[PDB]
């Protein structure tokens, strides 16, 4: 696992390289599902590499990755050691610039997540998590705050690439719900992985979204509950990660109150 | 004019070191208008240690500060040469080690900002611009983006420190017209400094926003409009200071798409 791991830091790095290089450059920016949701050709290039690399040295290994589900792949996950790759997080971000793309990995082995890597590198800042053995931030260990006080909370979430307007409706909703708590203010950096990494610093006290993927979120929450904070469903459940819906938090007591607060959004799993 | 500026950077860069050597320790935090409108200790003392260095070179002139004006001091503007500091713009941010946290200095004369110095200091990003002559963060020349169609766009904007239900209602029903348009996406990092610093940049087309003051886009404003941007005021009308509310985007194109769709809050 430290062999699996070790090397998808230094894979990790590489992608990134690819990834940065390209914010430099000419763009060619496509659509997925809709006018807003976006790809660029280095999405699928990258995705691409940290695939067929890993494949090679554990061709015994399945890959959940966006852009391949996007091509007809499928997101069931087992209990093989499965990679779960967003090759490029904040694809929009990416596309204008704005200066926070994360590449994320995460291992799964038996549907439990053992380590994760992401990567932003506009920052230059690499996240890892090994499970028991911490979460660092470019070798640095990190920490979430001691915030129990909902009313002192600084949160961050996203509005999501959809623009179905009972959904747009439900997601302010539930914002102004929890901004006339009130809390401190809400942050939206443009990615989950580093939304969820900057919970993870303690920089932010708790993230939440409805709408996200496994891969959005496979590598930041190893992150983020080794660095001893908690993930949780939107219900109060604990985390699913087919949900498409995670609380990410410094502590219980901060998840358990954003789930009270805020309505349930519906939107269909990754597992159907 | 270029002596006062190369000291305002000076002073900034030194400013945002306290700023972001005091960042790291505990706080403690006082409230101000709201029990979300803050202010800890170093607001205050960089504030101090900034109006003092600078009326310690340059007695003739008038300040405007956040904090000063906060503790009985007043926000009237003249066309002595007024600089207009804020300490700490974002302290929510700093109070909460979010790292976007920025030491802001606007030189206007003639009512007329001349130049202006914007340090983020976690970043090390030192932003400045000068009226004529360009737009530079660290060194590296700025220019706004080239986008001309609001469906393409990004947006940052800030949900504001008002709890007031109306007024925040207003807010969100903004946001939700423009994201509807829709809009490529909307963004916050915490500081209306940055935010225009990042449209500066490119990295953003347009950043809108009302509740701002003085201290607040009295940098960063020459910035966006040095680095080919527009400032204006939400009512697709002109900026001025005093405003109470701004758009900084890319073109002028974009600003007005923005101002069609918004309804101005009182
Ligand atoms: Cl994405
Ligand atoms: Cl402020
Ligand atoms: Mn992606
Ligand atoms: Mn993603
Ligand atoms: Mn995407
Ligand atoms: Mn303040
Ligand atoms: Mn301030
Ligand atoms: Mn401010």
Not at 3 to 27: F, H, P, S, W
Not at 41 to 64: C, G, N, R, W
Not at 159 to 186: A, D, Q, W, Y
Not at 223 to 244: C, K, N, Q, W, Y
């Amino acid at each position: 696992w430290q062999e699996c791991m070790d090397y998808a830091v230094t894979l990790a790095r590489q992608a990134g390289e690819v990834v940065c290089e390209a914010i430099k450059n000419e763009m060619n920016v496509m659509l997925k599902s809709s006018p807003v949701d976006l790809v660029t050709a280095t999405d699928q290039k990258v995705e691409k590499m940290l695939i067929s690399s890993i494949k090679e040295k554990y061709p015994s290994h399945s890959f959940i990755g966006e852009e391949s589900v996007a091509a007809g792949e499928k997101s069931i996950l087992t209990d093989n050691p499965t990679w779960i790759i967003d090759p490029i997080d904040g694809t929009t971000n990416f596309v204008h610039r704005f200066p926070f793309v994360a590449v994320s990995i995460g291992f799964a082995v038996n549907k439990k997540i053992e380590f994760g890597v992401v990567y932003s590198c506009v920052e230059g800042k690499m996240y890892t998590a090994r499970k028991g053995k911490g979460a660092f931030c470019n070798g640095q260990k990190l920490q979430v705050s001691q915030q129990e006080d909902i009313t002192k909370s600084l949160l961050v979430t996203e509005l999501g690439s959809s623009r179905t307007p009972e959904t747009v409706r439900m997601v302010l909703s539930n914002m102004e719900k929890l901004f006339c708590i009130p809390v401190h203010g809400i942050r939206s950096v443009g990615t989950a992985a580093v939304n969820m990494c900057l919970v993870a610093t303690g920089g932010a006290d708790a993230y939440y979204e409805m709408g996200i993927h496994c891969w959005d979120v496979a590598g930041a929450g190893i992150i983020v509950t080794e660095a001893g904070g908690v993930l949780m469903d939107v219900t109060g459940g604990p985390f699913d990660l087919m949900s498409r819906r995670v609380i990410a938090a410094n502590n219980r007591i901060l998840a358990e109150r954003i789930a009270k607060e805020i309505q349930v959004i519906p939107l269909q799993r990754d597992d159907e």
